[PDB]
mmCIF file of C-alpha atoms and ligand atoms in Angstrom:
data_model
loop_
_atom_site.group_PDB
_atom_site.id
_atom_site.type_symbol
_atom_site.label_atom_id
_atom_site.label_comp_id
_atom_site.label_asym_id
_atom_site.label_seq_id
_atom_site.Cartn_x
_atom_site.Cartn_y
_atom_site.Cartn_z
ATOM 1 C CA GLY J 1 8.816 -4.660 -24.859
ATOM 2 C CA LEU J 2 7.893 -0.971 -24.829
ATOM 3 C CA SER J 3 5.437 0.710 -27.168
ATOM 4 C CA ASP J 4 6.501 3.586 -29.428
ATOM 5 C CA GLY J 5 4.631 5.946 -27.064
ATOM 6 C CA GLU J 6 6.460 4.524 -24.053
ATOM 7 C CA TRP J 7 9.893 4.921 -25.719
ATOM 8 C CA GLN J 8 8.949 8.537 -26.481
ATOM 9 C CA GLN J 9 8.223 9.138 -22.772
ATOM 10 C CA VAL J 10 11.525 7.496 -21.805
ATOM 11 C CA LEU J 11 13.535 9.708 -24.144
ATOM 12 C CA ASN J 12 11.615 12.841 -23.068
ATOM 13 C CA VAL J 13 12.514 12.111 -19.425
ATOM 14 C CA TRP J 14 16.079 11.499 -20.540
ATOM 15 C CA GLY J 15 16.260 15.061 -21.932
ATOM 16 C CA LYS J 16 15.805 16.254 -18.332
ATOM 17 C CA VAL J 17 18.800 14.183 -17.249
ATOM 18 C CA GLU J 18 20.974 15.450 -20.136
ATOM 19 C CA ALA J 19 20.561 19.088 -19.024
ATOM 20 C CA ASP J 20 22.749 18.188 -16.000
ATOM 21 C CA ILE J 21 24.274 14.712 -16.498
ATOM 22 C CA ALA J 22 26.945 15.065 -13.788
ATOM 23 C CA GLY J 23 24.438 16.383 -11.198
ATOM 24 C CA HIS J 24 21.964 13.581 -11.866
ATOM 25 C CA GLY J 25 24.792 11.000 -11.933
ATOM 26 C CA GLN J 26 26.266 12.249 -8.644
ATOM 27 C CA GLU J 27 22.838 12.113 -6.921
ATOM 28 C CA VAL J 28 22.099 8.610 -8.251
ATOM 29 C CA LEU J 29 25.397 7.242 -6.870
ATOM 30 C CA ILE J 30 24.972 9.017 -3.506
ATOM 31 C CA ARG J 31 21.440 7.584 -3.219
ATOM 32 C CA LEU J 32 22.869 4.142 -4.011
ATOM 33 C CA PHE J 33 25.825 4.347 -1.586
ATOM 34 C CA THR J 34 23.872 5.835 1.350
ATOM 35 C CA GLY J 35 20.878 3.497 0.936
ATOM 36 C CA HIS J 36 23.044 0.411 0.376
ATOM 37 C CA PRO J 37 26.538 0.853 1.883
ATOM 38 C CA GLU J 38 27.642 -2.602 0.745
ATOM 39 C CA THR J 39 27.659 -1.168 -2.826
ATOM 40 C CA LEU J 40 30.343 1.354 -1.880
ATOM 41 C CA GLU J 41 32.608 -1.608 -1.104
ATOM 42 C CA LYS J 42 32.586 -2.578 -4.791
ATOM 43 C CA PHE J 43 34.425 0.687 -5.577
ATOM 44 C CA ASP J 44 38.006 0.716 -4.270
ATOM 45 C CA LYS J 45 38.205 4.336 -5.479
ATOM 46 C CA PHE J 46 35.185 5.461 -3.407
ATOM 47 C CA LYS J 47 35.779 3.452 -0.189
ATOM 48 C CA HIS J 48 37.495 6.477 1.401
ATOM 49 C CA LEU J 49 34.197 8.384 1.229
ATOM 50 C CA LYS J 50 33.124 8.058 4.834
ATOM 51 C CA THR J 51 30.405 10.763 4.877
ATOM 52 C CA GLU J 52 27.758 12.121 2.491
ATOM 53 C CA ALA J 53 29.505 15.527 2.642
ATOM 54 C CA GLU J 54 32.655 13.827 1.371
ATOM 55 C CA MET J 55 30.540 12.144 -1.332
ATOM 56 C CA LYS J 56 29.055 15.513 -2.399
ATOM 57 C CA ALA J 57 32.542 17.109 -2.453
ATOM 58 C CA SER J 58 34.070 14.358 -4.602
ATOM 59 C CA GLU J 59 34.686 15.561 -8.156
ATOM 60 C CA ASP J 60 35.715 12.024 -9.125
ATOM 61 C CA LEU J 61 32.302 10.744 -7.972
ATOM 62 C CA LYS J 62 30.616 13.237 -10.342
ATOM 63 C CA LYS J 63 32.965 12.122 -13.138
ATOM 64 C CA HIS J 64 31.948 8.488 -12.566
ATOM 65 C CA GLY J 65 28.249 9.475 -12.450
ATOM 66 C CA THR J 66 28.762 11.065 -15.879
ATOM 67 C CA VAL J 67 30.319 7.857 -17.227
ATOM 68 C CA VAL J 68 27.494 5.705 -15.827
ATOM 69 C CA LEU J 69 24.590 7.838 -17.044
ATOM 70 C CA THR J 70 26.221 8.426 -20.472
ATOM 71 C CA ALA J 71 26.425 4.650 -20.948
ATOM 72 C CA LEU J 72 22.819 4.168 -19.838
ATOM 73 C CA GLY J 73 21.647 7.033 -22.125
ATOM 74 C CA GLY J 74 23.325 5.404 -25.128
ATOM 75 C CA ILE J 75 21.537 2.170 -24.336
ATOM 76 C CA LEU J 76 18.123 3.815 -23.853
ATOM 77 C CA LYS J 77 18.355 5.625 -27.206
ATOM 78 C CA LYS J 78 18.551 2.180 -28.859
ATOM 79 C CA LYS J 79 14.963 1.511 -27.756
ATOM 80 C CA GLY J 80 15.646 -2.124 -26.843
ATOM 81 C CA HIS J 81 17.931 -2.847 -29.827
ATOM 82 C CA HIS J 82 20.922 -2.764 -27.502
ATOM 83 C CA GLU J 83 22.632 -6.179 -27.662
ATOM 84 C CA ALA J 84 26.038 -4.745 -28.764
ATOM 85 C CA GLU J 85 25.984 -1.977 -26.115
ATOM 86 C CA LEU J 86 24.662 -4.118 -23.299
ATOM 87 C CA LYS J 87 26.689 -7.336 -23.709
ATOM 88 C CA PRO J 88 30.140 -5.830 -22.748
ATOM 89 C CA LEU J 89 28.553 -3.961 -19.816
ATOM 90 C CA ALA J 90 26.973 -7.171 -18.535
ATOM 91 C CA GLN J 91 30.228 -9.061 -18.932
ATOM 92 C CA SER J 92 32.379 -6.381 -17.217
ATOM 93 C CA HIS J 93 29.975 -6.040 -14.302
ATOM 94 C CA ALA J 94 29.736 -9.818 -13.782
ATOM 95 C CA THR J 95 33.344 -10.872 -14.434
ATOM 96 C CA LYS J 96 35.423 -7.881 -13.387
ATOM 97 C CA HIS J 97 33.374 -5.749 -11.011
ATOM 98 C CA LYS J 98 31.411 -8.654 -9.441
ATOM 99 C CA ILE J 99 28.113 -6.722 -9.201
ATOM 100 C CA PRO J 100 25.105 -8.868 -8.260
ATOM 101 C CA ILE J 101 21.902 -8.178 -10.224
ATOM 102 C CA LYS J 102 20.409 -6.962 -6.894
ATOM 103 C CA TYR J 103 22.700 -3.907 -7.085
ATOM 104 C CA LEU J 104 21.320 -3.102 -10.569
ATOM 105 C CA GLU J 105 17.858 -3.218 -8.995
ATOM 106 C CA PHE J 106 19.128 -0.777 -6.322
ATOM 107 C CA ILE J 107 20.533 1.695 -8.893
ATOM 108 C CA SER J 108 17.334 1.449 -11.033
ATOM 109 C CA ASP J 109 15.300 2.403 -7.917
ATOM 110 C CA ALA J 110 17.784 5.215 -7.230
ATOM 111 C CA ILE J 111 17.259 6.667 -10.736
ATOM 112 C CA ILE J 112 13.475 6.794 -10.181
ATOM 113 C CA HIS J 113 13.946 8.466 -6.787
ATOM 114 C CA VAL J 114 16.370 11.081 -8.127
ATOM 115 C CA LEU J 115 14.026 11.912 -11.039
ATOM 116 C CA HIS J 116 11.226 12.672 -8.564
ATOM 117 C CA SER J 117 13.605 14.546 -6.245
ATOM 118 C CA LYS J 118 15.055 16.810 -8.946
ATOM 119 C CA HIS J 119 11.789 17.197 -10.914
ATOM 120 C CA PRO J 120 8.986 17.142 -8.308
ATOM 121 C CA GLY J 121 5.582 17.309 -9.972
ATOM 122 C CA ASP J 122 7.237 17.118 -13.437
ATOM 123 C CA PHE J 123 7.740 13.320 -13.608
ATOM 124 C CA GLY J 124 4.207 12.097 -14.263
ATOM 125 C CA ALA J 125 2.649 8.681 -13.723
ATOM 126 C CA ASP J 126 2.942 7.786 -17.439
ATOM 127 C CA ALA J 127 6.604 8.859 -17.468
ATOM 128 C CA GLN J 128 7.379 6.825 -14.350
ATOM 129 C CA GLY J 129 5.686 3.750 -15.874
ATOM 130 C CA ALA J 130 7.663 4.087 -19.108
ATOM 131 C CA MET J 131 11.054 4.717 -17.430
ATOM 132 C CA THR J 132 10.468 1.782 -15.042
ATOM 133 C CA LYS J 133 9.738 -0.513 -18.023
ATOM 134 C CA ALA J 134 12.931 0.638 -19.772
ATOM 135 C CA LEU J 135 15.064 0.008 -16.684
ATOM 136 C CA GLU J 136 13.482 -3.437 -16.151
ATOM 137 C CA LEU J 137 14.263 -4.315 -19.798
ATOM 138 C CA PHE J 138 17.873 -3.204 -19.238
ATOM 139 C CA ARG J 139 18.114 -5.242 -16.017
ATOM 140 C CA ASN J 140 16.410 -8.285 -17.528
ATOM 141 C CA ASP J 141 18.742 -8.409 -20.529
ATOM 142 C CA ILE J 142 21.797 -8.067 -18.191
ATOM 143 C CA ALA J 143 20.305 -10.904 -16.087
ATOM 144 C CA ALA J 144 20.172 -13.187 -19.163
ATOM 145 C CA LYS J 145 23.915 -12.575 -19.747
ATOM 146 C CA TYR J 146 24.541 -13.179 -16.041
ATOM 147 C CA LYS J 147 22.794 -16.577 -16.299
ATOM 148 C CA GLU J 148 24.927 -17.555 -19.317
ATOM 149 C CA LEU J 149 28.028 -16.824 -17.234
ATOM 150 C CA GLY J 150 26.633 -18.591 -14.152
ATOM 151 C CA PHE J 151 27.170 -15.408 -12.197
ATOM 152 C CA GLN J 152 25.421 -14.739 -8.913
ATOM 153 C CA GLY J 153 27.806 -12.527 -6.894
HETATM 154 C C1 HEM S 1 22.802 1.900 -14.778
HETATM 155 C C2 HEM S 1 23.596 0.874 -14.405
HETATM 156 C C3 HEM S 1 25.107 0.925 -14.650
HETATM 157 C C4 HEM S 1 25.763 1.381 -15.730
HETATM 158 C C5 HEM S 1 25.192 1.974 -17.033
HETATM 159 C C6 HEM S 1 27.177 1.224 -15.484
HETATM 160 C C7 HEM S 1 28.176 1.601 -16.357
HETATM 161 C C8 HEM S 1 29.531 1.511 -16.117
HETATM 162 C C9 HEM S 1 30.590 1.863 -17.046
HETATM 163 C C10 HEM S 1 30.343 2.419 -18.460
HETATM 164 C C11 HEM S 1 31.755 1.624 -16.445
HETATM 165 C C12 HEM S 1 33.171 1.821 -17.020
HETATM 166 C C13 HEM S 1 33.431 0.709 -18.060
HETATM 167 C C14 HEM S 1 33.355 -0.690 -17.478
HETATM 168 O O1 HEM S 1 34.147 -1.001 -16.531
HETATM 169 O O2 HEM S 1 32.521 -1.494 -18.009
HETATM 170 C C15 HEM S 1 31.482 1.118 -15.117
HETATM 171 C C16 HEM S 1 32.439 0.762 -14.200
HETATM 172 C C17 HEM S 1 32.193 0.267 -12.945
HETATM 173 N N1 HEM S 1 30.938 -0.047 -12.417
HETATM 174 FE FE1 HEM S 1 29.148 0.316 -13.315
HETATM 175 N N2 HEM S 1 27.349 0.658 -14.226
HETATM 176 C C18 HEM S 1 26.089 0.471 -13.694
HETATM 177 C C19 HEM S 1 25.828 -0.048 -12.447
HETATM 178 C C20 HEM S 1 26.776 -0.364 -11.484
HETATM 179 C C21 HEM S 1 26.502 -0.758 -10.107
HETATM 180 C C22 HEM S 1 25.085 -0.888 -9.506
HETATM 181 C C23 HEM S 1 27.681 -0.988 -9.488
HETATM 182 C C24 HEM S 1 27.955 -1.428 -8.019
HETATM 183 C C25 HEM S 1 27.007 -1.378 -7.086
HETATM 184 C C26 HEM S 1 28.722 -0.746 -10.488
HETATM 185 C C27 HEM S 1 30.069 -0.889 -10.267
HETATM 186 C C28 HEM S 1 31.076 -0.516 -11.109
HETATM 187 C C29 HEM S 1 32.470 -0.510 -10.738
HETATM 188 C C30 HEM S 1 33.096 -0.959 -9.399
HETATM 189 C C31 HEM S 1 33.211 0.002 -11.956
HETATM 190 C C32 HEM S 1 34.725 0.234 -12.063
HETATM 191 C C33 HEM S 1 34.933 1.604 -11.396
HETATM 192 C C34 HEM S 1 36.375 2.041 -11.411
HETATM 193 O O3 HEM S 1 37.127 1.618 -10.508
HETATM 194 O O4 HEM S 1 36.766 2.828 -12.309
HETATM 195 N N3 HEM S 1 28.144 -0.373 -11.672
HETATM 196 N N4 HEM S 1 30.117 1.043 -14.957
HETATM 197 O O1 PER S 2 29.019 2.160 -11.413
HETATM 198 O O2 PER S 2 29.071 1.995 -12.676
#
């Protein structure tokens, strides 16, 4: 798990995100879709986005980025005590959305990239270590639910 000090770093970084949730959320999804175009195919409602300019111009993409980062923020504020919040997310992403755990790795990497990109020189080595640990915990607990369900892809 994470130490008290590590959770404090995580939630400090998260304050940066909360100042512009939609902007951060938009940039995370664009990083995901452009780096890994197969992920776009999981979203019927974003498949029409053929260029990054179209992605940037999509107000619905920003809306979805808000939904995604709001959910993640709720989970992070539980400091690992997130069974009730995480279980339904794991089950919807396995059973309904069919999202392999690989894609959660991709979006975790995207969050780290966007933090550096939006906050260059203000996302320190300790903060990166703590945020990475929190995202691995999130991913690892989803993975346990995926194994229960026998889900791979
Ligand atoms: C930080 C990780 C993620 C979080 C917190 C998250 C959260 C959410 C939430 C709250 C919803 C709406 C409620 C629901 O259907 O459960 C949702 C929907 C969805 N998610 Fe995620 N998600 C994450 C990662 C991903 C990834 C990596 C993909 C695909 C690569 C994905 C694909 C989808 C799709 C296809 C929907 C339905 C979209 C729609 O048509 O409205 N999610 N997600
Ligand atoms: O994408 O959630």
